[PDB]
Design a protein around this motif. Sequence first.
Motif, PDB file in Angstrom:
ATOM      1  N   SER A  47       0.858  -1.180   0.000  1.00  0.00           N
ATOM      2  CA  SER A  47       0.000   0.000   0.000  1.00  0.00           C
ATOM      3  C   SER A  47       0.896   1.233   0.000  1.00  0.00           C
ATOM      4  CB  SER A  47      -0.864   0.017   1.261  1.00  0.00           C
ATOM      5  OG  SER A  47      -0.036   0.147   2.418  1.00  0.00           O
ATOM      6  N   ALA A  66       5.716   4.005   1.887  1.00  0.00           N
ATOM      7  CA  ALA A  66       6.338   5.184   2.484  1.00  0.00           C
ATOM      8  C   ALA A  66       7.392   4.709   3.476  1.00  0.00           C
ATOM      9  CB  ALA A  66       5.291   6.029   3.198  1.00  0.00           C
ATOM     10  N   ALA A  67       7.042   3.684   4.244  1.00  0.00           N
ATOM     11  CA  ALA A  67       7.955   3.120   5.231  1.00  0.00           C
ATOM     12  C   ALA A  67       9.132   2.449   4.537  1.00  0.00           C
ATOM     13  CB  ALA A  67       7.214   2.114   6.111  1.00  0.00           C
ATOM     14  N   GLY A 114       1.016   3.427   2.278  1.00  0.00           N
ATOM     15  CA  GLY A 114       1.532   3.569   3.629  1.00  0.00           C
ATOM     16  C   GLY A 114       2.743   2.690   3.854  1.00  0.00           C
ATOM     17  N   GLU A 115       2.638   1.441   3.416  1.00  0.00           N
ATOM     18  CA  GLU A 115       3.731   0.495   3.558  1.00  0.00           C
ATOM     19  C   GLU A 115       4.907   0.965   2.706  1.00  0.00           C
ATOM     20  OE1 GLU A 115       1.418  -2.922   2.224  1.00  0.00           O
ATOM     21  OE2 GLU A 115       1.111  -3.578   4.290  1.00  0.00           O
ATOM     22  N   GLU A 137      11.616   4.993   3.456  1.00  0.00           N
ATOM     23  CA  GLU A 137      12.347   5.501   4.618  1.00  0.00           C
ATOM     24  C   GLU A 137      13.360   4.463   5.090  1.00  0.00           C
ATOM     25  OE1 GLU A 137      12.459   8.518   6.281  1.00  0.00           O
ATOM     26  OE2 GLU A 137      14.076   7.532   7.384  1.00  0.00           O
TER      27      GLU A 137
END
Lengths: 235, 234
Positions: free
Chosen positions: A67, A72-73, A69-70, A76
């Motif tokens: 996703s 984005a991590a 969200g995943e 990072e």
Amino acid sequence: ALLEICCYSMECALTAQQNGADRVELCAAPKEGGLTPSLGVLKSVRQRVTIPVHPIIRPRGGDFCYSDGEFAAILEDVRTVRELGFPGLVTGVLDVDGNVDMPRMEKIMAAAGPLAVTFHRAFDMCANPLYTLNNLAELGIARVLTSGQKSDALQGLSKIMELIAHRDAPIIMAGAGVRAENLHHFLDAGVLEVHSSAGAWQASPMRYREYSRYIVDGAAVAEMKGIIERHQAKL
Amino acid sequence: ALLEICCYSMECALTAQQNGADRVELCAAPKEGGLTPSLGVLKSVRQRVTIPVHPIIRPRGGDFCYSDGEFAAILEDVRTVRELGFPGLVTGVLDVDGNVDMPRMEKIMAAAGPLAVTFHRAFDMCANPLYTLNNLAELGIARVLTSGQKSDALQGLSKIMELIAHRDAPIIMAGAGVRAENLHHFLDAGVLEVHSSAGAWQASPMRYRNYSRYIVDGAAVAEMKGIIERHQAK
């Protein structure tokens, strides 16, 4: 051939190093098939292990269709692994149809900078092996971890050999079920890099009753390294 | 009672929040029972989630008798969660005899500083529940997650009510099998906080092949919050 050992702890990574491992793939959560290690573990390995260590970047088990969200991590974590000084990392992202998600992978390559990126077993779940290899080469992927798209690398040996023969493609590293008993098959096939967990079960020290711990068997690492050295000596 | 939802991603934590969760326990690896999330996930949550979030600090599944190597990582993770600004964290270390490892837990508390530390289900593996509560209080532990030392919290509810009567102990948070259908039982019992993993394994969207992801059930979170509110209202 180069021997890479999958380690689920700093202690296991050190054990692999002291027993001949040429490289370590650093993961957490063996029951998930390998997830991104916490910052504490990453920093610990950077301070305790000297051989090349490539941390896996995978937020969860299951498929590789992450996703936003995943992702984005993931981005990072890539930046962090680069910042911490690791020489490489292991990851992979696919779309719902099993094709490499190029936009996502390009973003990962940009964040990785000069690191040697390994595209992992997501490759074994992708469609069109050769086409995928070409795309991975375009991305600048250094190597690909694969079982020849079979349950284990030995079953997929014929496929692996086809991948190695394929022109303009990253290094092919055989993985899944690779151990001392079958290592010679890959060596004779011309496989340049092999991946093994050298796994072993460690009984829990708990007296009041938690289960066994999955760890690296130093003797197994040394045994596989000896097999590689002897094979490298004959041919 | 305060509602804490166990979430395995930033998006699930946000969903929990939007549906009334008072707090989120942030974990990775649902198949391992919850392990420490990566820095990327931690930073993502601090950027998107506003309600209290307590990340779990656990390097591997299985027992809580960590090696010196694993413990070194644990302390660095505690320092990291503190530096990132989380209000609390969840962890636990035990000795081979089912007792809290006080010397090592003390080092964790030191590293944790002002963060509210939750001692997790390692509590349910301890030999003496009351003596363990005293030990947690001695350490400065804020709360403890327990199923009353039974397979599920409902089965151990009578034990939980007994534990709640013990003064100068950390807050007792019922957990394991807590859901909308049985929440009223914990509320009636007088439990101050409840922990739920309200969710399910969602199938993978993959349309090609040569139960894949555990997601929070926002509707269940909203339903439980309603039950809590109505229970307090009238």
